[PDB]
């Protein structure tokens, strides 16, 4: 390594607006980048209790925390100490659309995250505004280059009650602050994000993520 | 009318971020709500010169300015004095996605607009980041009710340098502040938006829009 | 006109498969191309009674029948005597997707139509498989050139029972058989298609369409 | 297993039309359902030489051939001896859209496949009509139930000459012929399909696929 330590701290601040509802959320966590694991304690500072499903926000709360094999270029760890930023569009199957971005920096053993999240057109009686989501199912992000920019497309899904699912398509564009960072070839990153615990109105949430990069079958 | 006068003034302020670029734009205009015509002078206050096509922002700079026939319920004019707000998603064909919102209020003979505009995933060499757009073509917005909310869907297109077109799909949701405003039936609203004048880097722009509601064929 | 007559006959045969159900439908009608009006009597020869809403098929049952103004190039009437063909994708909001095609020829005062229609992934309890549709709302097709081919994109909507709408996005590509047919500029074509009458299971249906091309506002 | 043997034979016949081009392709192959592996020799009977990229057709040439772990319900193997059928929509990022379906039956140790493939709106200068595809990248299909039907959504990509990728979204619906077959819970199926060899104009092609079901991270 050198720039990134086996054990890193995580500082985050999110501000956003969904369907006209404003909110500010603080995060404090720790993680093991080389093992692709991280945990974070979230505290809603303004706008709580959120009138929408907390789950839509969780992936906004850093691909640095992903276990990359030696045969696959790790664009994220190679982006530090300078850092990088990402933008994302979350297209839900019922018309709800969100965009999010995060500017990631590093100071010592801590990653700093300036996050913004905006969402519109969620149906009033949909699972998001009615808070009927249970969790995101694990996923496999497809990483590839588009017009010189590392891009990740994902078939995501939120589990609802009675074993039904609510689909969302993700497209994330990753850009290192520093020019010249070597781009990886087409690959994958498996993810599993989960809310380990939370209070009744999700004003306090403990989040966790495990991610591993790979080259898919047959390797 | 009653609450809305034949000649209204327009005050507007937009704050946004497209592809990581922050910006603030002020607007000052006038319009004839009953004739579906309005004009406005825009001035970039922060973030100038914008590194993207000014055209993506223009429709963000009020359906009250649309000529509604007596046989079609005018949800927008009926939303005042209290006012209304809208949310929109602009999905471009090359992956770029924007979401915008406008909270509209009225004090005297002036409409006030609190607008926000966010855009992500625009390709570096796409027409937006390369400023190769010329104008939005006229359009026809399809207005209908979805889950109790007035919704407008549009097949939009930007004429590009070179004579080709760049498609964008619009979905706007409109919500009156006052509960109980009668919802209209399925109808249409023709639009024509144009930048009348502008300086080199569009730090100063004069915008115009003409809109008329109708019931399509055969009527 | 010269090639196309004010009064034309229409012969058509459609073969298709929706959600695994095969069918063949024959049609005979008449229309006035220069007035953009046509009518046709349809009869299900094989596959009756259809297990899905007949409405999804109706637009598959010729833009020659559209009233074009002198200032807009009429790509369709100019395609005969040789004729033309079109392909179309109908993407419904619930995942249902259909593609269709029509190879159009002419002999004397009659247009012949070789139509094919295929639909997949319609939810078992959706409005299509449950036959809960009432009609297509009138529309405005946006005509433009894409990669050298005349294309028509449309925000279509099926009015459903219960005062709700079911959206479908249309993309039709039109290609003249003979080279040198001048391509028109960006324009619109208003449409209004309706099933005038039908028997209980829609084995026999009378269809009608009125269409007018135009330049949109302010012209 | 019982109904399905460790070694099975595959008999297939595809009939289709892409951008107006008709074709008939026969297939003969073998595979090991429990190992999730299969191979097949294809031969174009009518329509050769195909004017479009052969790669768009390959996934149309049976999830029975997928290694399913004991902890995940195998809807496919439990569908025999009666069999099952599937429908698929392939939405390419440039507007090209294809639908396909396969009715799969079994007699002895041989699977019989009645396949149909139709495609429309492929741009003349797109990679499909210009035959610039190299291969499909490996993928991970997300399996879940929508309206009582097993559904698979996939973020697919074709590697193109020149190192870039061309995206396509897959949605396949799977339906057992026999009522009752237990529906699985949300899961995944990794895929890797490759053309092992082919002659000049792809009139003869040797295809191969490897697939393995799994529960994602952390398991």
Which of A87, A91, A116 lies closest to B19 in CB terms?
A87
Whole-number Å distance between alpha carbons of B74 and B101: 20
Count Cβ atoms within 10 A of the Cβ of residue D206 and give its class: 0-12 exposed, 13-18 middle, 19 or more buried. Answer: middle
Query: Would you put residue B127 in left (φ > 0), alpha (ψ -120 to 50) or beta?
Result: alpha
C142 contacts in B (CB within 8 Å)? 137, 139-140, 155, 157
CA-nearest residue to D149 within chain A is A164
Distance, in Å, from the CA atom of D143 to the CA atom of D173, rounded to the nearest integer, reads: 10
Q: Do C191 and B138 touch (CB under 8 A)?
A: no
Distances (CA, A) of D135 to A215, D54, D152: 15, 10, 21
Phi, psi (rounded to 5 degrees) for C79: -85, -10
CB contact under 8 A, A167 and D153: yes
Interacting residues of B58 by C-beta distance below 8 A, sequence separation 6+: B136, B193, B195, B207
Supply the CATH number for residue A80's domain.
Answer: 2.40.155.10
Cβ pairs bridging A and D (under 8 Å): 80
- Cβ–Cβ gap A19/B87 under 8 Å: yes
Mutate to test the interface with B, among C155, C171, C172, C194 (most CBs of B within 10 A): C155
With CB atoms and an 8 Å threshold, state whether A146 touches B85.
no
How many residues does this entry show for chain C? 219
- Resolution in units of Å: 1.9
Interface probe for C, chosen from D96, D97, D146 (most Cβ of C below 10 Å), is D97
Cα–Cα distance measured from residue C213 to residue C35, given in angstroms and rounded to the nearest whole number: 11
What are the beta bridge partners of residue A20?
A: none
Distance CA A62, CA A188 (A): 15
Give the N- to C-terminal CA distance of chain D in Å, as an integer.
24
Give, in degrees to the nearest 5, the angle at Cα A60 between A59 and A66: 60
* C118:D99 CB<8 A: yes
Q: Is residue B154 within 8 Å of B136, Cβ to Cβ?
A: no
Two tokens, residue D169: 């979204």
Q: To probe the interface with C, which of B39, B94, B140 has the most C CB atoms within 10 Å? A: B140
A interface residues, B as partner, C-beta within 8 Å: 17, 19-20, 85, 87-89, 91, 95, 97-101, 103, 116, 118-121, 123-126, 146-149, 171, 173
Nearest CA distance, C210 vs chain D (angstrom): 25
Kindly give the pairing relationship between strand C110-120 and strand C133-136. unpaired
Of C145, C186, C190, the CB nearest to B216: C190
The 3-state secondary structure of C74-134 reads: CCCHHHCCCCEEEEEEEEECCCCEEEEEEEEEEECCEEEEEEEEEEECCCCCCCCCCCCEE
How distant is the Cα of B47 from the closest Cα of chain C, in angstroms? 33
Instruction: Give the integer Cα–Cα distance in Å for D203 and A103.
Output: 51
Closest residue on chain C to D177 (Cα) = C20
Q: Residue C129 is part of which domain span?
A: 1-219
Cβ atoms of residues C48 and C68 within 8 Å:
no
Partner-chain contact D88 C149, CB within 8 Å: no
Domain count, chain A: 1
| Chains near B (3 or more Cβ pairs under 8 Å) | A, C
* Nearest CB neighbour to B120, from listed A101, A124, A125: A101
Nearest to B101 among A103, A120, A146 (CB): A120
Per-residue H/E/C for chain D: CCCCCCCEEEEEEEEEEECCEEEEEEEEEEEEHHHCEEEEEEEEEECCCCCCCHHHCHHHCCCCCCECCCCCCCCCHHHCCCCEEEEEEEEECCCCEEEEEEEEEEECCEEEEEEEEEEECCCCCCCCCCCCEEEECCEEEEEEEECCEEEEEEEEEEEECCCCEEEEEEEEEEEECCCCCCCCCCEEEEEEEEEEEECCCCCEEEEEEEEEEECCCCC
- Whole-angstrom CA distances from C143 to A144, B74, C118, C124, C179 are 34, 29, 24, 34, 20
Give the three-class secondary structure for A14: strand
Nearest CA in chain C to D97: C89
Å between D46 CA and nearest CA of chain A? 34
- CB contact under 8 Å between B120 and A146, yes or no, is no
CA distance C143 to chain D (A): 15
Contact B14, B114 (CB under 8 A): no
Alpha-carbon distance D49 to D203, whole Å? Answer: 6
D99:C87 CB<8 A: no
Residues from chain C that touch B139, judged by Cβ atoms under 8 A, are 142, 216
From the list D145, D191, D216, which residue is nearest A138 (CB)?
Answer: D216
Determine, for residues D142 and A163 on separate chains, whether the beta-carbon distance falls below 8 Å.
Answer: no
CA–CA min distance D11, chain A (Å): 25
Strands A110-120 vs A8-18: parallel, antiparallel or unpaired:
parallel
Query: From CA B156, how far away is CA B136, in angstroms rounded?
Result: 7
Cα(A146)–Cα(B54) distance, integer angstroms: 24
Count CA atoms within 13 Å of residue A102 on its CB side.
25
Of C91, C126, C147, the CB nearest to D124: C147
Q: Which residue from D minimizes the CA distance to C103?
A: D20
Q: How many angstroms separate the CA atoms of D105 and D10, rounded?
A: 10
Angstrom distances, CA of residue D104 to CA of C148, D59, D77, D107, D133:
40, 14, 12, 10, 28
Nearest chain D residue to A145 by CA distance is D164
Please name the member of D145, D163, D190 whose beta carbon is closest to the beta carbon of A216: D190
At A84, list the tokens: 């990088």
* Set of chain A residues whose Cβ sits within 8 Å of the Cβ of B97: 89, 91, 97, 99, 171
Q: How far is D22 from chain A (nearest CA, A)?
A: 33
Rounded (10°) CA dihedral C112, C118, C122, C128: 10
| CA distance linking residue A21 with residue B78, whole number of Å | 24
Residues A100/A113, Cβ–Cβ less than 8 Å? no
Residue A165 CA from chain centroid, whole number: 19
What 3-state DSSP class applies to C179? coil
Chain B residues in contact with A120 (beta carbon < 8 A):
87-89, 99-101, 173
CB contact under 8 A, C118 and D118: yes
Among A97, A145, A168, most B C-beta atoms within 10 A, so best to mutate, is A97
Cα dist. C31→B175, C36, C108, C197 in Å?
Answer: 43, 8, 14, 17
The secondary structure element, H or E, covering residue B145 is: strand B139-146
d(CA D38, CA D129): 28
Q: How far apart are CA B218 and CA C2, in angstroms?
A: 28
Residue with tokens 């595959």: D10
Find which of D91, D96, D147, D176 to mutate to test the C interface (most C CBs within 10 Å of its CB).
Answer: D147
CB of D129 closer than 8 Å to CB of D123: yes
The verdict on a CB contact (< 8 Å) between C148 and D116 is no
Between chain C and chain D, how many beta carbons pairs sit less than 8 Å apart?
83
Interface with chain C: mutation pick from B93, B134, B142, B172, highest number of C CBs within 10 Å:
B142
Which one of B146, B155, B217 has the shortest CB-CB distance to C142? B155
């Amino acid at each position: 390594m050198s720039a990134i330590k086996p054990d890193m701290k995580i500082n985050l601040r999110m501000e956003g607006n969904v369907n006209g509802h404003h909110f500010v959320i603080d995060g404090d966590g720790t993680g093991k980048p080389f093992e692709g694991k991280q945990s974070m304690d979230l505290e809603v500072k303004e706008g709580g209790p959120l009138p929408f499903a907390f789950d839509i926000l969780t992936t906004a709360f850093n691909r640095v925390f992903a276990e990359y094999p030696d045969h696959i270029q790790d664009y994220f760890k190679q982006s530090f100490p300078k850092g990088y930023s990402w933008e994302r569009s979350l297209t839900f199957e019922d018309g709800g659309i969100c965009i999010a971005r995060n500017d990631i920096t590093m100071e010592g053993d801590t990653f700093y995250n300036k996050v913004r999240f905006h969402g519109v057109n969620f149906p009033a009686n949909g699972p998001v505004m009615q808070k009927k989501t249970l969790k995101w199912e694990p996923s496999t992000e497809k990483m590839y280059v588009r017009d010189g920019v590392l891009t990740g497309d994902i078939t995501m899904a939120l589990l609802l009650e009675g074993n039904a699912h609510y689909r969302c398509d993700f497209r994330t564009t990753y850009k290192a602050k520093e020019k010249g960072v070597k781009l990886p070839g087409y690959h994958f990153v498996d993810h599993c994000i989960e809310i380990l615990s939370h209070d009744k109105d999700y004003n306090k949430v403990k989040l966790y993520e495990h991610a591993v990069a790979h080259s898919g079958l047959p390797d």
